[PDB]
Design a protein around this ligand. Structure first.
Ligand SMILES: Nc1nc2c(ncn2[C@@H]2O[C@H](COP(=O)(O)O)[C@@H](O)[C@H]2O)c(=O)[nH]1
Ligand SMILES: Nc1nc2c(ncn2[C@@H]2O[C@H](COP(=O)(O)O)[C@@H](O)[C@H]2O)c(=O)[nH]1
Ligand SMILES: Nc1nc2c(ncn2[C@@H]2O[C@H](COP(=O)(O)O)[C@@H](O)[C@H]2O)c(=O)[nH]1
Ligand SMILES: Nc1nc2c(ncn2[C@@H]2O[C@H](COP(=O)(O)O)[C@@H](O)[C@H]2O)c(=O)[nH]1
Ligand SMILES: Nc1nc2c(ncn2[C@@H]2O[C@H](COP(=O)(O)O)[C@@H](O)[C@H]2O)c(=O)[nH]1
Ligand SMILES: Nc1nc2c(ncn2[C@@H]2O[C@H](COP(=O)(O)O)[C@@H](O)[C@H]2O)c(=O)[nH]1
Lengths: 174, 175, 177, 174
């Protein structure tokens, strides 16, 4: 069992709204790059970029960051960057990280630290489809599809058509 | 004096708000916009046109007019409804009130009451271009163009093309 | 079957924090009156008043509002809270009034309370403190002071127990039925 | 000058309220340490620690992080950690960073990086007296004395008695 929170239509409308928020807050998307985290983040980033191209008429560059969980186990797991593929110079550019779910914030901090270390973007923003709460760092998403309250024993399933052959956000037990 | 939104920023805020309204109401079926006073009504019409463009269905726009009444002896004026024109039945429908500036919240409270003498809507939401803070009632906007905390000794000037021949939001010293 | 969200200590901490937020935002609680809604709101208001008296050294006046649900459109359609009585022992004109309730949900109860106060007096402002905000607002109303956000799903509600009313202090979420 | 925002009394009330928030959210402040950034942050952390102990009778440890702005030209400056004095093991502990003003977020990110790398706290929170907006990273304060959006062309003056012989927060055109 699992409670469906967003269906395909609700995902589409949240992403469309997010695109218009990005255009609003960046005053056009000139000099902005989207960088998706991991598989689902990258597909979200591509969906946003296509939407923005359609709205403004200019392409938006999309990069990728890969992040993987390392364990003791010996426990605090640690996400570490395994690779980045960003096809343009980010220095003095606005970078928007994109991910499916925000939870502790540790994945984004790794992504942020990587970008800040390797380039000097003028700013880094964050867009997520879901914020599930329970942050363990002072990190917040600038753009949020849906706030989904959860308990620690719950997990959010994000399905995307490209990866999963369904567009759906649902909450489930472990 | 600061300019806070220029014409382009106003347009992008209203476009975003339209998409927010479609999102949260899951399509703007069974949802009506009601504008407060002159500028709110024009903002409501702008939002309605945008929504029609996005979803392909018209959205009904109503109007509420609200006048300030005053007593003798900074404060104590009371906004009262002086007319409403809502062209459809609002009972069991979602209504979104629309205004330019949220300040004390007293004007919205007068509008919220009025709505309830014309239908029992299933819910009432509020969209404003600017929230300037200093609420005197527990009222909040659900959709906000720009959140702009101000001092009591400041004022927000909202100009709209339909009324003022220019689109702008700026803050100036009340003094 | 319920999850305890706040125990007696966490309720005390939230209310203590709320008292300090009130003092901060009102820059002292001079010319402020607390008005509790229904039974549990009133007891919360009294607790908050006692705390504020302790912090600032001056008593805070507490009033009461009673509010009851009426039905039926007779077609079922949404119930309407109406004010049944109010006991406010001082003049509120030009005073700050803080409404106090246990749980904020649609906002309709507070709108009735607010409409009443604004009608019969002309306070300089009205604020709202609640122990719990459960979400699902149907009106543009928010609490100024909030003990705990406890979002509820469709089948859930929030149980609030207070020592004065329930012989125990606890906030828990439960499945209705 | 352009505006006062907090006088002494307001600073005292905001810090008292913050202390109560910290007791509430951390359920007492057991296994929680405050770390002040730079001179003014450290004085704020000390005021908060003293208040917290008075409320429930439990002492709070205060550490210090020093952070200096490095420049590449004589507006992309970089705050770097110059020193830290953390007097207890922070592994599996909650840490609260404390500063006077949050602006771009880059100072906090440097401080965070300094903690997260050199201890493994269970979480890191942030308390500030003023949030002045214009963030350039997805960083937010958990505790805020006063939320004060500003233009890039104004500065926030924070005066604290320990240093400045006056308590005040004000905005200045600069
Ligand atoms: N689908 C899903 N991903 C999660 C969930 N919690 C964490 N994640 C994954 O882990 C990262 C977020 O976790 P955090 O690092 O913020 O704790 C994201 O890359 C996300 O894909 C969840 O509840 N559901
Ligand atoms: N244009 C402008 N209108 C204001 C301002 N403050 C209040 N108002 C107007 O008065 C109403 C809101 O004031 P409130 O009733 O919320 O105090 C709105 O209808 C708005 O048009 C302001 O600072 N600028
Ligand atoms: N950026 C900026 N904000 C101001 C100025 N004056 C007032 N404000 C904003 O409005 C609030 C004023 O609230 P007051 O305490 O004056 O009622 C401040 O907290 C701040 O957020 C100003 O000169 N510049
Ligand atoms: N104990 C409790 N009371 C509730 C709950 N939901 C609504 N209420 C009660 O109903 C009123 C608020 O409901 P509203 O009018 O905001 O929909 C309050 O007076 C409160 O006592 C809940 O989940 N638990
Ligand atoms: N007093 C003051 N300090 C500031 C201001 N802007 C940044 N800072 C200092 O710089 C840090 C925050 O800047 P950030 O790194 O967030 O851009 C804090 O350590 C703070 O003391 C300001 O406007 N006034
Ligand atoms: N109240 C007030 N806020 C200001 C003033 N100047 C700037 N701000 C705040 O700072 C924000 C950003 O300023 P901007 O970066 O757009 O110049 C404005 O949206 C506004 O909230 C001012 O003179 N008074």
């Amino acid at each position: 069992q699992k409670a469906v929170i967003l269906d395909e239509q609700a995902i589409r409308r949240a992403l469309t709204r997010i695109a218009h928020e990005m255009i609003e807050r960046n005053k056009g998307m000139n000099n902005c790059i989207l960088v998706g985290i991991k598989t689902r983040g990258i597909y979200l980033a591509k969906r946003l970029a296509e939407r923005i191209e359609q709205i403004e008429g200019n392409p938006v560059t999309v990069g990728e960051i890969d992040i993987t969980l390392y364990r003791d186990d010996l426990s605090n797991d640690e996400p570490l960057v395994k690779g980045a593929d960003i096809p343009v110079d980010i220095t003095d550019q606005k970078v928007i990280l994109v991910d499916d779910v925000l939870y502790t914030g540790r994945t984004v901090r790794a992504g942020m630290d990587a970008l800040v270390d390797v380039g000097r973007p003028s700013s880094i923003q964050l867009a997520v489809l879901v914020d599930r709460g329970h942050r363990e760092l002072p990190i917040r998403a600038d753009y949020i599809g849906k706030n989904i309250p959860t308990s620690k024993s719950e997990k959010v399933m994000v399905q995307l058509d490209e990866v999963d052959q369904n567009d759906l956000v649902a909450i489930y037990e472990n």
